Design a protein around this ligand. Structure first.
Ligand SMILES: [Zn+2]
Ligand SMILES: [Zn+2]
Ligand SMILES: [Zn+2]
Ligand SMILES: [Zn+2]
Length: 192
């Protein structure tokens, strides 16, 4: 019954150490198992150990948290632009000409011949059937007596002041005269 003794005070777990380990530290002390890197979670039962605000950390860890991180970054830039050149054009023209007109001249001419026409039928007369009579020309076929109708030739024909007839007509028309005659009367007797 009578017993107690002494021990340490674990300011970590808040339990009194029954004199066994009572790990001491900078103005502090915790149980052995208690004294464990609260970072890596690995027990810390050796030197090279560090402490911290109500906590314990192994050197390394300490140098890890305390240690730096690294460097930052930088930057850059750049730009450029240019352009030019443009020109073009052209033009032209032309004229024209004309052409006037010139008048014309006249000429002369003349030429005649023989031959004639048929004043009877009306057609023309030139050889083949051309007759000349009464100082006129006509078709030897048409050329006939304008009294009997009997066709003529030239001589046998008779040109009466333009007119044309047959000798028989030219003669008769202008025939000679003839003597006349009469009758007498004998005598007889009567009886019964
Ligand atoms: Zn403890
Ligand atoms: Zn650690
Ligand atoms: Zn004729
Ligand atoms: Zn006749």
């Amino acid at each position: 019954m009578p017993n107690w003794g002494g021990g340490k005070k674990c300011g970590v777990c808040q339990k009194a150490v029954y004199f066994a380990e009572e790990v001491q530290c900078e103005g502090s002390s915790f149980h052995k198992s208690c004294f464990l890197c609260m970072v890596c979670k690995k027990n810390l039962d050796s030197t090279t150990v560090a402490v911290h605000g109500d906590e314990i950390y192994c050197k390394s860890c300490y140098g890890k948290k305390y240690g730096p991180k690294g460097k930052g970054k930088g930057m850059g830039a750049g730009t450029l632009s240019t352009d030019k050149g443009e020109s073009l054009g052209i033009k032209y023209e032309e004229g024209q000409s004309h052409r006037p007109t010139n008048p014309n001249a006249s000429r002369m001419a003349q030429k005649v011949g023989g031959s004639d026409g048929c004043p009877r039928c009306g057609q023309a007369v030139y050889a083949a059937e051309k007759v000349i009579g009464a100082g006129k020309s006509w078709h030897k076929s048409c050329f006939r007596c304008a009294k009997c109708g009997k066709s003529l030739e030239s001589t046998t024909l008779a040109d009466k002041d333009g007119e044309i007839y047959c000798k028989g007509c030219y003669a008769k028309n202008f025939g000679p005269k003839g003597f006349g005659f009469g009758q007498g009367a004998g005598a007889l007797i009567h009886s019964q």
